[PDB]
Amino acid sequence: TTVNVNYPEGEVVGVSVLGIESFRGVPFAQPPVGNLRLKPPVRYTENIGTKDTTGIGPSCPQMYLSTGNGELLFQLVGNLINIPLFQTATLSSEDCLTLNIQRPAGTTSNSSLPVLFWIFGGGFELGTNQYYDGIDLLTEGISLGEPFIFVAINYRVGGFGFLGGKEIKADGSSNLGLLDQRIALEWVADNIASFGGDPSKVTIWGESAGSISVFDQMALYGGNNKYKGKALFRGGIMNSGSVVPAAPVDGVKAQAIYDHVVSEAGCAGTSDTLACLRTVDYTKFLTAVNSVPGIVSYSSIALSYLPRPDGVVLIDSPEEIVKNKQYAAVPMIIGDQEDEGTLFAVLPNNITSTAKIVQYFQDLYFYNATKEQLTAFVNTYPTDITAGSPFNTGIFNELYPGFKRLAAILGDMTFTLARRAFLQLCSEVNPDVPSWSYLASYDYGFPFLGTFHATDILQVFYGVLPNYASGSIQKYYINFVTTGDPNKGAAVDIQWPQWSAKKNILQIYATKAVIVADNFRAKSYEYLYNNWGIFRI
Amino acid sequence: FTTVNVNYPEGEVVGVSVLGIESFRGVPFAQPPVGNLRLKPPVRYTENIGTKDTTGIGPSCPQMYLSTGNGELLFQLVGNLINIPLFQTATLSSEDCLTLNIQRPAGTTSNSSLPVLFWIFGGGFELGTNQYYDGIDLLTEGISLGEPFIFVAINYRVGGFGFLGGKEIKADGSSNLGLLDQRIALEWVADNIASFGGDPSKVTIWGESAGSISVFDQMALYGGNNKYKGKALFRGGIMNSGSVVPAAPVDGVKAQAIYDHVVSEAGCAGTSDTLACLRTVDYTKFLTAVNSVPGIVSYSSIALSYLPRPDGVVLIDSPEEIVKNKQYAAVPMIIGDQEDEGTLFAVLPNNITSTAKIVQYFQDLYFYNATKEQLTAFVNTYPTDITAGSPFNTGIFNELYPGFKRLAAILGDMTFTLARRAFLQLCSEVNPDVPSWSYLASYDYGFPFLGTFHATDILQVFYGVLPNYASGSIQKYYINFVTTGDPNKGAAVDIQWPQWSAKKNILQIYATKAVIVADNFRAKSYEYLYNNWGIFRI
Numbered sequence A: 001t002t003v004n005v006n007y008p009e010g011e012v013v014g015v016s017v018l019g020i021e022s023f024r025g026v027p028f029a030q031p032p033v034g035n036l037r038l039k040p041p042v043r044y045t046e047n048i049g050t051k052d053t054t055g056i057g058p059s060c061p062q063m064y065l066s067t068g069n070g071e072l073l074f075q076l077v078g079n080l081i082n083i084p085l086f087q088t089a090t091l092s093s094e095d096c097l098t099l100n101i102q103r104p105a106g107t108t109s110n111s112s113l114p115v116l117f118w119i120f121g122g123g124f125e126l127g128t129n130q131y132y133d134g135i136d137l138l139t140e141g142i143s144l145g146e147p148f149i150f151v152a153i154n155y156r157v158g159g160f161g162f163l164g165g166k167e168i169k170a171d172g173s174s175n176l177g178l179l180d181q182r183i184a185l186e187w188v189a190d191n192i193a194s195f196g197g198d199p200s201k202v203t204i205w206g207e208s209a210g211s212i213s214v215f216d217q218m219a220l221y222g223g224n225n226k227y228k229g230k231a232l233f234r235g236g237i238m239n240s241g242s243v244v245p246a247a248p249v250d251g252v253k254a255q256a257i258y259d260h261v262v263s264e265a266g267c268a269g270t271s272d273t274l275a276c277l278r279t280v281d282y283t284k285f286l287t288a289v290n291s292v293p294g295i296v297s298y299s300s301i302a303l304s305y306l307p308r309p310d311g312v313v314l315i316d317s318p319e320e321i322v323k324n325k326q327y328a329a330v331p332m333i334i335g336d337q338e339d340e341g342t343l344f345a346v347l348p349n350n351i352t353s354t355a356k357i358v359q360y361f362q363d364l365y366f367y368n369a370t371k372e373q374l375t376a377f378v379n380t381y382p383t384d385i386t387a388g389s390p391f392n393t394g395i396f397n398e399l400y401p402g403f404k405r406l407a408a409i410l411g412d413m414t415f416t417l418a419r420r421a422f423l424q425l426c427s428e429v430n431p432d433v434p435s436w437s438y439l440a441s442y443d444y445g446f447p448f449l450g451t452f453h454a455t456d457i458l459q460v461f462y463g464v465l466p467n468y469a470s471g472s473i474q475k476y477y478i479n480f481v482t483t484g485d486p487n488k489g490a491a492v493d494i495q496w497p498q499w500s501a502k503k504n505i506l507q508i509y510a511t512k513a514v515i516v517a518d519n520f521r522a523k524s525y526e527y528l529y530n531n532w533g534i535f536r537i
Numbered sequence B: 001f002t003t004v005n006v007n008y009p010e011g012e013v014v015g016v017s018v019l020g021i022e023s024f025r026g027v028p029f030a031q032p033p034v035g036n037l038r039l040k041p042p043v044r045y046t047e048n049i050g051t052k053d054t055t056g057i058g059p060s061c062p063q064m065y066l067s068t069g070n071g072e073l074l075f076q077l078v079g080n081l082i083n084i085p086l087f088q089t090a091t092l093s094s095e096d097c098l099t100l101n102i103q104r105p106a107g108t109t110s111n112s113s114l115p116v117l118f119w120i121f122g123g124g125f126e127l128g129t130n131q132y133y134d135g136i137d138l139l140t141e142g143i144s145l146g147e148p149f150i151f152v153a154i155n156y157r158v159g160g161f162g163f164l165g166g167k168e169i170k171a172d173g174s175s176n177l178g179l180l181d182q183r184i185a186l187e188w189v190a191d192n193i194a195s196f197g198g199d200p201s202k203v204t205i206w207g208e209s210a211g212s213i214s215v216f217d218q219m220a221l222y223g224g225n226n227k228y229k230g231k232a233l234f235r236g237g238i239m240n241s242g243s244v245v246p247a248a249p250v251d252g253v254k255a256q257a258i259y260d261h262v263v264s265e266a267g268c269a270g271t272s273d274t275l276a277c278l279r280t281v282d283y284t285k286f287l288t289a290v291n292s293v294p295g296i297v298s299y300s301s302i303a304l305s306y307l308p309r310p311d312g313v314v315l316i317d318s319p320e321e322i323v324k325n326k327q328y329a330a331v332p333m334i335i336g337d338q339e340d341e342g343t344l345f346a347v348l349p350n351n352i353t354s355t356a357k358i359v360q361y362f363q364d365l366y367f368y369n370a371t372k373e374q375l376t377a378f379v380n381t382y383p384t385d386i387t388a389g390s391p392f393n394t395g396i397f398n399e400l401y402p403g404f405k406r407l408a409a410i411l412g413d414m415t416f417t418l419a420r421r422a423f424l425q426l427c428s429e430v431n432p433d434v435p436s437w438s439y440l441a442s443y444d445y446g447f448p449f450l451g452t453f454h455a456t457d458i459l460q461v462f463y464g465v466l467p468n469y470a471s472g473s474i475q476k477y478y479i480n481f482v483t484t485g486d487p488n489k490g491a492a493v494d495i496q497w498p499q500w501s502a503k504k505n506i507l508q509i510y511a512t513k514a515v516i517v518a519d520n521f522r523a524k525s526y527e528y529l530y531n532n533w534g535i536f537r538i
Ligand SMILES: CCCCCCCCC(=O)O[C@H](COC(=O)CCCCCC)COP(=O)(O)O
Pocket: A442, A443, A444, A445, A446, A458, A459, A464, A465, A466, A467, A510, B086, B090
């Protein structure tokens, strides 16, 4: 029970169980090590012959926790996991540019199935394809309706993926994680066909950083998603991310991280700082990049690492890119969990007032907004305990005072009201490029967090628990990849309306779904839309 | 997948034989402590339980990983989330937890008469279960050595289910329930192990941490009476990291305070019989209430909310007094420590950076019967020099925050490493003819910040990872001891392990080697503590 495949780069061996044949950790690019560290990936020139992917793939270097920032226990854990035994135990190395392919069983060079290409989210600091297993997701596609190929990729995070500033910029070494994603895609154009894939029936799916990534791909190179004269993908599914306004890669925040990253790495004062870092051994290296503030901190979503406009790969701030019609527009489904904020609001329990909230954004989030506007945006948000997230929970779930408020805010600005804003602009500049959006509520009443960020990965992606939300979301996605419309393919219980028609979205409870106005929290949404620019993070 | 089964006096169980080991997981040893039996001493089954499938994974007793009412906000949030029924179900955790696991070599019969190793898990009296202590590696080692045995790992109640104190608990006769679970389980073994191929007259009890402390408490129980039906329950003890823990009584100020708090959280305050309200509270609410108090993963650290406390019957007196008065069942024993016991415990309380601060911290949370003068004197036996502290012999390294190494050392010594020496000394005085062997584990030397830290023995010794000198020698020493009553008899050993009392020497075990050394390090600390053991009642 093993297989088999031969392709232009090489040939591969996979193991099939219960109707799915999976190849894990197939190489897609040169291992970005030695001098290739901190530089764009390169597709393999010379055929790599035969490798076993019977195994478990690697992960690129993780940043679960800061080695230099945060509370002391977290720093301690961050340093420890960084040691060689731990990385080895978990298979994490600079040698990460590999990918996973999972198929129905028996599929062949003529099978010509559509492609589902996943991008994991870890807030650009972590994540890997290791635990996203395609199986009953692919199983449902087979279980009825439409079979497909599943692709899960690995890409550089933290320092490896998204180091910033001056020096990186000159080298054209910006936004490597993005490039990794792009090169993976190109590999799909060339090689996926040997696997019985249909090229350019390719739909890209992402969550969190993955979702933000999907939009970034459409945006890449001023929106040209054309490889060898053919479109790289035909559709996009984004869960809980899309447009993110960021200051330029040349920017104060990015130059500073880079400056302390070096200082920690002892390449400082060297003539060529950048050149030097590729000098440094991996363990010392990981430790320096992870020195920065991390997601699991007070810093929260003011990420040390994210994509930043550089003007080639990422020519402009993403909101502007939409406005200027400089992205590849393709059919899309975009979603948010009802309570995206809550997880993010937990750590900064400092922030007990708008005046407090304001200073917080001003210290760390937006250097471009005056105290005047921010105070206005936040004020769009009530202090009322009832008004917060988890939404519709009354006086309950108030972890500390203002938590629900902050959660609503962090959740909105970044994701939920970020999404409609994308939708409105997308409707304006590319009307006639269809789109659908939804709200997840299947986890209502879960204490404190409600239907929180990344709840989907379980409920939808692994389909736990099995129920109305699972079958329904899946059917829609499965249909979408197969047909390019959520509603077409399989028979669907509720016809999911285009967002632009009546500005409606689907709201899915565990056992029910319904159609509602995507109009909530309008004044907050409105201030943001009118003012999206000052929120460049 | 081969099944195998055993008829025994209380029932029949079906187990599983894999790769030369037969395992029965989830064998009940006592009536479920639910309903009227929550917060009551364990009771043996009065009726045959029938035939049980033990082929699966067994349950755990309710856990207190993190506090629901104390500590950092994130921890509180997680502490509450763990308690929802969906997660409880997922981890097989409930009040119906009095079960044990049995593992034996394939082909064992009621005829076999093997030695029994009885394992008690440690979780600081707040957590832990037998679920993740599988004997296959240890057993595989014994079989390979020619000294096969039967492995028994128990569940016992922890936290508020097991160790709730206060006067009402005392009056009910319900103190130290978790110790009673362990004891009743020993009694089950005495009755029933022969059916499984085990010899009830050759039981060795072993534990780590709270389990270790628990081994001494078993020797201590009922004034040293370890006889059931006229025979000794165990013949030897192995203690890894912990032994004698001086404590204030079950109806003391700390204990009463914890109980009053739990009662208030549970909605039982002002009832005519509060301990009786507690039995009627819904499980989720009760769990939330017991876990309400300060947890081990907090600033309070090893000043535990739940622990064994003297009640006058089950535990007659504070444990140091018990040894002194020759009131424990003195059996051959092995006792040991990881070189750096306190490092893990000193991570959270990182505002404790000075002599004055350490003293304040102890006076506030730890020792209510010690003066500032006495504490300051004990603390001052520890240098402030970075080199002096723990992790030991690491020089200028590993100083997590200033004073961390000193605090780790103090925490390590009073609770563990120095207490062990004091115990050894007392026993030799009152029981000179009962042999003891001790050692210090250093196999993880150089590990950053923590060194050879608390519970490192679970990996190196219980699971034998990584395979090396340390694992082979210790396991072999332990296995011989289970088989013969001496760590040196049985399989041939590289280094003869001396009895402690001869020259007060111990084994220090490195990853690749072992050496004999004097148990006299940090003598001034030891001596103060030994001379003053009573003040440190927690
Ligand atoms: C080991 C836990 C994995 C199962 C979680 C079930 C989630 C999906 C399920 O369909 O929704 C829920 C499960 O419980 C939810 O309240 C949230 C729990 C998930 C968060 C876990 C961090 C289904 O519950 P129900 O409405 O009662 O059918």
